[PDB]
Design a protein around this ligand. Structure first.
Ligand SMILES: [Ca+2]
Ligand SMILES: [Ca+2]
Ligand SMILES: [Ca+2]
Ligand SMILES: [Ca+2]
Lengths: 92, 15, 90
């Protein structure tokens, strides 16, 4: 239809939450380990267990980071979202 | 506006 | 008190389930379901699909396990693609 679909507004929300957190420290277009942690603990507090150990955020960043700059760009964050969403899906 | 065909753990006790 | 990010993820699951459930395999998008999904729900991000050739090309790109349909994981890859391109105009 002509209204923004639920899908199209979901995509936008993904962009907004990324930019909401990537803009905090350093590079405004990437998530340092610092910003990723806050995102997870604050915005995924119903799907994922809170992170309070540094080893965890390091390992998550290690798995998310494919271009090897030690931070998560948007493309890499969409991959992360894909994984988590997939996990919630297998709840039938 | 706009685009077209280009084409390039944990979890928890929840509801 | 669920977050915007979490609502967005859930809307992703919901729209897949809405369209995949219409025809055939209720857990997968066949070509016709995918086309309707794009035309009805992505009308502001993708140009409308009018040609079979276009449906064909899109599904082939998305179908990574070779069964001719788009399961959920293949749909998430699709949503990642689309969102990332849009991201460049934000
Ligand atoms: Ca940053
Ligand atoms: Ca990176
Ligand atoms: Ca189907
Ligand atoms: Ca497939």
């Amino acid at each position: 239809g002509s209204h923004m679909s639920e899908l199209e507004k979901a995509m936008v929300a993904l962009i907004d939450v990324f930019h909401q957190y990537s803009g905090r420290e350093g590079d405004k277009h990437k998530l340092k380990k610092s910003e990723l942690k806050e995102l997870i603990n604050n915005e995924l507090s119903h799907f994922l267990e809170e992170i309070k150990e540094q080893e965890v955020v390091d390992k998550v960043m290690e798995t998310l980071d494919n271009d090897g700059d030690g931070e998560c760009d948007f493309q890499e964050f969409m991959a992360f979202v894909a994984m988590v969403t997939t996990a919630c899906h297998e709840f039938f | 506006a706009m685009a077209a065909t280009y084409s390039a753990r944990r979890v928890r006790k929840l509801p």
